């Protein structure tokens, strides 16, 4: 119902909106007498400096640090200093036969990253038929994973296939 004041205040859209002071602040000072508006020590400092400058993205290491002790993570020659930020080598230590370690080179946190690429796929996997079939089963299992995550999903499926390898 009270629409005249609304549209009338909306008319004064351009930059010259200052008389509102003389129209309202006398009445406000009359009814309200608050000395406490912003007397406390305060200053606006939005940003000074924000960057890692010390390590890899925190989310990845923080998440992989809580994985099982069955795995072991370390670093290769540093060919992923800034962008990749991870070049990991994992060796499954459990009640099963081990295998060739993965590459584990990830991308930004969107994670469309099939991090291992099997650089030594051909010979190291044609060495024996058993591990060759193991690799084949792994690859067949990987494609069904929608938007897999190298951090958890990839390694988990790899361990699952390696433990199912005994048929």
């Amino acid at each position: 119902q009270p629409l005249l004041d609304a549209v009338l205040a909306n008319i004064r859209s351009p930059v010259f909106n200052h008389s509102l002071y003389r129209t309202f602040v006398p009445a406000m000072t009359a009814i309200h007498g608050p000395p406490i508006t912003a007397p406390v020590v305060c200053t606006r400092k939005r940003r000074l400096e924000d960057d890692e400058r010390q390590s890899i993205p925190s989310v990845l290491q923080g998440e992989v640090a809580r994985l099982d002790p069955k795995f072991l993570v370390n670093l290769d020659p540093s060919h992923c200093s800034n962008n990749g930020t991870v070049h990991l080598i994992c060796k499954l230590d459990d009640k099963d036969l081990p295998s060739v370690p993965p590459l584990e080179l990830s991308v930004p946190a969107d994670y469309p990253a099939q991090s291992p690429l099997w650089i030594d796929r051909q010979w190291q996997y044609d060495a024996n038929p058993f591990l060759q079939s193991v690799h084949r089963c792994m690859t067949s299992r990987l494609l069904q994973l929608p938007d897999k995550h190298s951090v958890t999903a990839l390694l988990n499926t790899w361990a699952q296939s390696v433990h199912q390898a005994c048929l």
């Binding site: 930059v15 010259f16 909106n17 200052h18 008389s19 002071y21 003389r22 602040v25 006398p26 000072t29 020590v41 200053t43 400092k45 000074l48």
Partner: protein, 358 residues
């Protein structure tokens, strides 16, 4: 002034300060003499001043500034009429750092109102008469105490209009002088405050007569156009009459070595429902490096007209200033171009006339 800059061969290092001590021994009299000499040189040459680190503690400054003003007024001999603004800016700058901030703000307000009045006086596009309009208006000082309504028509009423499009000063700038005289009135009968001059005293008398002339001319303006600068609080539509009467009373009671902050005080102790507040009192921070150490960084500074000039939210380019101004850069107006024109260049001691975003 012996204060060098720390850009020596040490890498990307910032500036530094050094002691401006001119020699090993001390000579307070000769030192203050040299200081006054160089300050007068800077004044007559109109250059910048940074003898802050050079001058002694502000205790002597009072004696220094009063002796300086005496020498200036006596041995001007007539260049005072053009060096008044310069010497007042010098006074303000020197009394800024010290305590005596009261006289500092007093000097600011005196300067700004004097400039405003001196600009408004010959700004009348009146019709010619027996004598000049400004010269005829100047004689208003020789008039009775009360009943302005008589003397206003007794001097002149017709020849005061300049143009129809003049109704921009009442709502924007004329409120300044009104709020100022009201603040002076309300603060007078409060000598019991823990400050002998309180906020200010303004016992000059001449300035009071000047403000009285301003009030009578804005009164004749209001008679010429009903949209003048009222009390803005209550009973706005004959307060101006009693305001003029009280200010004339204080004027007469203070012109020739009069009383100060007894029946006058008792009667002005009455405060009608018209008291306004929230006046600008324009001023800026400083570098209070007293004697030992005050180090500042490049960022994150460490703590130590009348169309607003201090709003809540920012809404324009927000041009900054040093003396009092802190006003808009394009001024966002149509016909106030007189003020803008007079303040196009550097303002009163406007070396700190800067700009700031946000």
């Amino acid at each position: 002034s012996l204060a060098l800059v720390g850009i020596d061969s040490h890498g990307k290092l910032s500036v530094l300060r050094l002691s401006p001590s001119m020699g090993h021994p001390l000579e307070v009299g000769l030192a203050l003499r040299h200081l006054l000499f160089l300050l007068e040189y800077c004044m007559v040459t109109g250059y910048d001043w940074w003898d802050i680190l050079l001058h002694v503690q502000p205790s002597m400054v009072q004696s220094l500034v009063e002796k300086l003003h005496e020498e200036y007024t006596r041995q001007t001999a007539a260049l005072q009429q053009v060096l008044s603004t310069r010497i007042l800016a010098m006074k303000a700058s020197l009394c800024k750092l010290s305590r005596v901030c009261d006289y500092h703000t007093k000097l600011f307000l005196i300067a700004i109102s004097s400039t405003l009045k001196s600009l408004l006086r010959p700004h009348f596009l009146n019709t010619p008469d027996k004598s000049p309009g400004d010269r005829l208006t100047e004689i208003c000082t020789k008039i009775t105490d009360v009943d302005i309504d008589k003397v206003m028509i007794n001097l002149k009423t017709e020849e005061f209009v300049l143009d129809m499009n003049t109704l921009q000063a009442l709502q924007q700038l004329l409120q300044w002088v009104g709020d100022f005289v009201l603040y002076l009135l309300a603060s007078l009968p409060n000598q019991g405050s823990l400050l002998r001059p309180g906020h200010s005293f303004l016992r000059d008398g001449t300035s009071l007569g000047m403000l009285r002339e301003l009030m009578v001319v804005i009164r004749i303006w209001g008679l010429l156009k009903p949209s003048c600068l009222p009390v803005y609080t209550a009973t706005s539509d004959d307060s101006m009459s009693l305001l003029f009467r009280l200010l004339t009373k204080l004027w007469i009671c203070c012109r020739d070595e009069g009383p100060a902050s007894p029946a006058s005080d008792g009667l002005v102790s009455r405060l009608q429902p018209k008291q306004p507040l929230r006046l600008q009192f324009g001023r800026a921070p400083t570098l209070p490096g007293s004697a030992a150490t005050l180090q500042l960084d490049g960022l994150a500074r460490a703590p130590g007209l009348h169309l607003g000039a201090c709003p809540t939210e920012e809404c324009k380019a927000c041009t900054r200033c040093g003396c009092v101004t802190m006003l808009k850069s394009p001024n966002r107006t149509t016909a106030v171009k007189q003020w803008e024109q007079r303040w196009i260049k550097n303002c009163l001691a406007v070396e700190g006339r800067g700009p700031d975003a946000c």
